Amino acid sequence: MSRVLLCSAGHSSMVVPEAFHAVPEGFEEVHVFTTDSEKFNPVVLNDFFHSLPNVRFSITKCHGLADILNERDFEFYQEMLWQWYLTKMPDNELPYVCLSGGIKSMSASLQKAATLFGAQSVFHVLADNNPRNIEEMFDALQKGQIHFIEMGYEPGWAALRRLKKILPINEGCSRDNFKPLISKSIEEILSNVKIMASDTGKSNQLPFPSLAILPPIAQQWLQLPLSANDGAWIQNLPKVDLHCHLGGFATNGSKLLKDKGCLIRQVELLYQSLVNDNVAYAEIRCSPNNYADKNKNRSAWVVLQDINDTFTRLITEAKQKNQFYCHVNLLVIASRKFSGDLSDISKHLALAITAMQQGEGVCRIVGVDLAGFENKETRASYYEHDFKAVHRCGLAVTAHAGENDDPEGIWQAVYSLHARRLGHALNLLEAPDLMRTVIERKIGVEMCPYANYQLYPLKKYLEAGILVSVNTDNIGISGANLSENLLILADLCPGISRMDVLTIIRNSIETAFISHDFRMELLKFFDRKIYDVCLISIKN
Amino acid sequence: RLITEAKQKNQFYCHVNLLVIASRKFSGDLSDISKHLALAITAMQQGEGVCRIVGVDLAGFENKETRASYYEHDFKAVHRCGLAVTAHAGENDDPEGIWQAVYSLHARRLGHALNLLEAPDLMRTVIERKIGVEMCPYANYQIKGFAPMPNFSALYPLKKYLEAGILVSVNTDNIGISGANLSENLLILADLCPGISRMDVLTIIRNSIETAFISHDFRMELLKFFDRKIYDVCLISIKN
Amino acid sequence: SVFHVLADNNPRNIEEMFDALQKGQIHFIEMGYEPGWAALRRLKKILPINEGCSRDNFKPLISKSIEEILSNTGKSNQLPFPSLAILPPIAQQWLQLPLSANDGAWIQNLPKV
Amino acid sequence: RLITEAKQKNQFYCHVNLLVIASRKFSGDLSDISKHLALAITAMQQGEGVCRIVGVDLAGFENKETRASYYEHDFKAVHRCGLAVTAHAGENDDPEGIWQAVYSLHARRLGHALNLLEAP
Ligand SMILES: [Mg+2]
Ligand SMILES: [Mg+2]
C-alpha cells in the first residue's frame, strides 16, 4: 500500500518536508510539481529525502513557463499539472495531497485536479514561524508549532480518472504540437452534464451495456452504422464465445486425439488463440466419450478430468502473472446416436453430473448440450424423464433445434427439456407465438453467423428483443474467428451499428451459465474494458 | 378510460394491467379453476386495448388442500396460449411445492416464499433462472413476525435475498387490511432489514421492472421513462 | 462562473488599477463553468438565518456524508438506469449510504412499481 | 491393492465388490438420489480393475412414508447402462411395496422381507 504524496512548491520548498512530517505515520512516495523557474532550491528537499532512501521521491519540471502571466500560460500549466497528477495516480488507490505550497493559481488548479480525479484526503499545513531550514522546522514540530489542516475527502470521477490509457503518443506535450487532451476530457464531462440537464428527449437513457460518460461525439460515432474498417476496434473489444467445439480447431478428433499429448497441445493452442482474440469468457463443448481409450486405460472421465486440470493450470498461470486471461467452462455434449448403445446418453449425463460435483477449481462444468442430428427422430419428446435427474442437481441445459425443424419442436424443447439456452433456430420469424414465448422467457439464441453463411434475421431478432449471442461454432472448420463473426454482419445485415454489437455482447454475458457473483464480476471487468477501448479508439 | 383520460391531459398516469386469480377450493367444485383460466385466455384474446390481462394467478390457503402440483394438465393449454403464471408457492410451503411450481407449471413468479433460505438448491435454480419473488413487507411482517417484533428472534430475509441475486420485488398485497401503501412498504425495510441502502432500493425497483410480463418495446419505453424520472428525482433528492 | 484576477503590479489605489485595466494589464483566469449539484439549497430552508449563534451549534450535516464517501464490490456494479452514472458523485455516495426512516419524502417522490 | 497383494503371495484372498447405497434422505435435498445414481454409473463406467462396483442399494427410513413407490422413474438410466438393483424393504412394510420393488425397479435382491410368509 502506497501513500503517494503530490504537491506543488513555488518560492518556498520547505513545505514538502512539513507535509511529510505532518502525519507521523509516514508516507511512501512523494512527488512535487514545479515550473522551470530559477528561484527553486531543489537541493534541500533532495538531501532531506536522501536522508531516507526508503521513501521514493521524484521531481517533475514544467518546461517553458517561468510563471503564469496570461491565459495560455495558465492553461498550459493546468494541462501539465493534470497530466502529471493523472500519470502519478496509484493504480488502485486514492492519493494524498497538500495545497499549502505555491501561489493561489497553482493551489486552485491542484484543488481542481483533486475535485476532478478524487483523493484520499486533501490537506493544508500551517507554520507559525515559516521555517526555512530543517532543524528549525523540526524544533517547531517538536514544540507543537506544527499545524496540519484538512477538509477534503472525495471519491472523484471514476470515468475521468479512468482515461490515463491515452497519455502515450504525445512525446511529452511540446508546446509546438501540444493538444490539451485533459481539456478534451473536461469539455466532454461538462458537455454530457449540460446536455443531460438541458434536454428530455435525449435524456431518456440509450446505453444498456452501461457507460453514458463518453463524449457526445463518441456516442454519435457509436450510433452510426458500423463499417468494414472497424476491424481494429472490434478486435480490441473483449468478446464472449458461448458455442465453441474443442475438437474442431486444428482441422482430428476421434482418430488422432486419443493420446494425452495431442489433447494437451490442443488445449494450450486453443487457449492461446482465445487469449489472442481478446475473448474474456467462453463455454466449450467437448465429447469425452469420443476421446477416451479403454485400451490405454483412458476413460471418458479421465479425459474430462485431464481437460479440466490443464484448463485450470493454464488460467492459473495466466492470472498469476497479472495479464489478461480467458475464463472458460466446459459443456458436456450429449452426442446423438439413436442407432445403438442408447445408454450412452445416460452415461454422458451421469458423467456431467459427477464432473460438476468436483466443486473446486476456477474452471468447472456448468451445462450439457443436446446437440446431434436435430431432426424429428431425436426431438425433445424422448428423454425428458431422464433430464429430470440433471435438472434436479441444478445443472443448465443447452439444446440445439435450429436446422430442419418445425416450430413445435422448438416449443417443447423449450417447455419439456426447459433449455435455459437455445441454439440456432434461424426460422423463428415465421412463428410469432414462438417469438412471444422466447422473448417473454428471456431464453437466448446461439445463432452462428459464419455457420449459416457457409436476409439474415439477426437484425430483426435484435429489434424483437431476443437475447441473441454471436457465436463462432468451429473456428477451425469455418476458418474464421469470432472477430470475423461480428465483422461479417456489416454486409450480412445492412444498417447494423456498433451499439447493436455492444448489446450483442451484453446479451452474451447475461446468457452464459455462470453464478451471480461471477456474472457481476465479469460485467464489471467488461464495462471497464469497453469504456477504456472506446475512449482509446475515439481519439484515433 | 381512466388511463386514456389521464394521458390526454399529459399528466402522470399509472399504467395498469390485471391478474386473474384462480383460487383452489375456495368456492366448492374445482371446475371453477378451469372456468377462471378459460375466462382469462378469452379476455386475453381481446386483441386491441391499453389495460390488458397479462396472465393468471394461483393462490391458496396454506398447503396440501391448496398445493401447487394438482392442476398441471388443466394449465397446459392456458400456458400454451401465451399467458404467465404467478404461483403462490410459499408461506410455510414445503420446498417440493415450490420446485413443482417453478418447474412443472413454469411459474415466472412466486408469492412470499419466505423460507426459501433453507433450500440451497432451490435458491441456486431460482437465481440461475431469474424468477421473480413477490413479497409483501408489512403483510408478512404482521402475519408472521420478524425482528424487531417483541418476543421474536426470526429476522426478515430480504437483505440475503438481495445479495444472493434473487429478482425480489416489493409489493403491497392488501392495502386496506395491512394499512400500508407502497411508500411505507419500502420505508419499513430500514428498521426491518438493518444495513439496507438506497441503492438496493433502486435495484429492487429495477428487478420489479424486469419481472413484469410485458412486451419488449413497452419495456424499453418504460425503462427510458423510469430512468429519466429517477435521475430527476435523485437530482432534487439531495436538496433535503 | 468561478474565476481569478491577476495583477502584475498589484495596484493599491483606484487610479492605478483603473489605468491597468485601461491598458489591459489585469488578466482573467477561469477553469470553466461549474454546474455544481442541481439541488442542494433546502439546507438553507431547514436551517434558519441563525443570526444569533456561536461555535456551540455547528452543523456537520454534509461532512458526515463526506467522511462516509469512501470510508465504508456488490454495491459498485449494481448500477441500474445507466443515466445514473452522470449523477454527481456526492449524490452517488449518498445513495450508497444505508436507508433510514427520514427518507419518506424521497420514497414518496420515488416512482415505484 | 489389498487383494492384489494377497493374491501375489498365493494366499487366501477375499474378493470384494462395492455397493453404492442410495440413502433415502426423506427430504434431505432429494437430488442426492440422482447424484448417487450418476456416481454409481460413472464408477461402473471406469471399468478397468479387478475390484469393481456392481450395483446400487436403496434403504433407510423403512417406514411407509419412504416406500419404493416414489423413485420408480429415476432408475431407468442406471438399469439401462447395465448396473444391478437392490431394494431393502419388508421389515415392517406392507405386502405391496415388495411387489412394486420387484416389478418396477426390477430389484434382483430383497432386503429382509421377514413378513413375506403372510403373502402367499
Ligand atoms: Mg456447433
Ligand atoms: Mg396475496
Numbering used by the authors:
A (entry chain B): 1 to 251, 300 to 502, 515 to 600
B (entry chain A): 361 to 600
C (entry chain A): 121 to 192, 200 to 240
D (entry chain E): 361 to 480
What text does the study give?
First, we used SECMALS to analyze the oligomeric state of the protein and found that the majority of Cad1 forms a hexameric (403 kDa ± 0.451%) species in solution, with a small amount of the dimeric (139 kDa ± 1.1%) species and of a higher molecular weight (5–31 MDa) megadalton fraction (peaks “H, ” “D, ” and “M, ” respectively). To understand the organization of the protein at the atomic level, we solved the cryoelectron microscopy (cryo-EM) structure of hexameric apo-Cad1 at 3.6 Å resolution. Consistent with the SECMALS data, the structure displayed a trimeric arrangement of Cad1 dimers forming a homohexamer. The dimeric deaminase domains form the core of the hexamer by arranging themselves with 3-fold symmetry and are linked to the CARF head domains through a 51-amino-acid linker (L1, inset). Further, we observed that the dimeric CARF head groups are tilted to one side with respect to a vertical axis from the center of 3-fold symmetry (black dotted arrows). The tilting of the CARF domain around the L1 linker brings it close to the deaminase domain on one side and distant from the deaminase domain at the opposite side (labeled as “closed” and “open, ” red arrows). On the other hand, mutation of W349, which interacts with its counterpart in another Cad1 dimer via π-π stacking of aromatic rings (inset), led to the detection of a stable dimeric complex by SECMALS.
In order to identify novel CARF effectors, we used Foldseek18 to search for proteins with structural homology to CARF domain of the Cam1 effector. This method rendered a 600-residue protein containing an N-terminal CARF domain followed by a linker region and a C-terminal adenosine deaminase (ADA) domain, with accession number HAJ98955.1 from an unknown Bacteriodales bacterium (hereafter named CRISPR-associated deaminase, CRISPR-associated adenosine deaminase 1 [Cad1]), for which homologs were already identified in a previous bioinformatic screen. cad1 is located immediately downstream the cas10-csm genes of a type III-A CRISPR locus. Further analysis of cad1 homologs showed that over 70% associate in genomes containing type III systems (mostly belonging to the A and B subtypes) and exist within many unique phyla of bacteria. These data suggest that Cad1 is a widespread effector in type III CRISPR-Cas systems. Altogether, these data demonstrate that Cad1 deaminates ATP molecules to ITP through the formation of an hexameric complex that requires a Mg+2 or Mn+2 cofactor and an activating cA4 or cA6 ligand. While the triggering of a growth arrest in the host is a common strategy of all CARF effectors, we believe that Cad1 introduces a new mode of defense for CRISPR-Cas systems that couples nucleotide deamination activity to a sequence-specific, RNA-guided adaptive immune response.
